[PDB]
Structure to design on (292 residues):
């Protein structure tokens, strides 16, 4: 959703690399968030997004 | 961005400001730094020489 | 300038340090660090 | 290339890697001789260092 | 503003209040100062000799 | 008086200090810093 607007052809290599970097960052960030963080703003923003 | 590598600070005006926090063993290989350390896109250390 | 260091020790101290440590410019006998002036490395990472 | 005993404190601030500032908002307008003197005349002091 | 340079504190009354923070290597250039450091318009270090 | 030091070491000690660290004077065996009585350096730059 945060990189759907720039790719307008077949995925150029740099875009795929960006996808992979975001994959690794978001995967490490998201694992078990409810057990990890318990403040209202983060949970509400996560569910809304 | 720019960054220096291989510099040599003056010895007669030598000084330390982290003595309580870090310590290095006595070896000239440490005394005259021939390499530099920098940060990758992800927070990982890179080693240029 | 970008966060640079001439020995692994100071780099490890920078990693162990909390938020706001990257702006510091500590030095040693013949080893030193140059801290980033814009806090780019902390601000960029947060948004993945 | 850069000499071994470069004053490292030059690198701790936003600066020009050439070792001598040449920002053209400082020089007088259209004074080509003044501008080239600012850039290249090493018998007159640089700005900001 | 006024600021001193080249001053000699009495040795027979010497003292330190920063020992846990800073440590200067043993060299007479550090023991007997002949330089002063001051700040410019921008928060950067400048040297007077 | 204006913030001045006889050795870069105490200057680097001052640069890492928190808010208002400039005001306090410090001395060593044969080196010293004199703090600026007016907090001019913090106040002026605080405006951005």
């Amino acid at each position: 959703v945060e990189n759907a607007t720039l790719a307008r052809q077949a995925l150029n290599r740099i875009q795929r690399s960006n996808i992979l970097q975001s994959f690794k960052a978001k995967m490490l960030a998201t694992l078990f968030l409810l057990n990890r963080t318990r403040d209202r703003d983060y949970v509400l923003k996560f569910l809304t997004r | 961005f720019f960054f220096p590598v291989g510099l040599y600070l003056p010895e007669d005006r030598g000084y330390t400001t982290v003595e309580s926090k870090v310590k290095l063993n006595d070896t000239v290989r440490n005394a005259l730094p021939t390499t530099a350390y920098l940060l990758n896109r992800d927070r990982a250390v890179q080693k240029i020489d | 300038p970008i966060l640079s260091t001439t020995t692994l020790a100071l780099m490890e101290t920078k990693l162990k340090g909390g938020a706001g440590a990257f702006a510091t410019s500590e030095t040693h006998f013949g080893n030193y660090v140059v801290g980033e002036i814009i806090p780019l490395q902390q601000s960029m990472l947060f948004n993945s | 290339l850069t000499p071994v005993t470069m004053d490292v404190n030059y690198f701790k601030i936003p600066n020009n890697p050439r070792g001598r500032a040449s920002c053209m908002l400082a020089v007088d307008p259209y004074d080509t001789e003044a501008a080239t003197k600012a850039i290249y005349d090493h018998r007159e002091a640089d700005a900001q260092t």
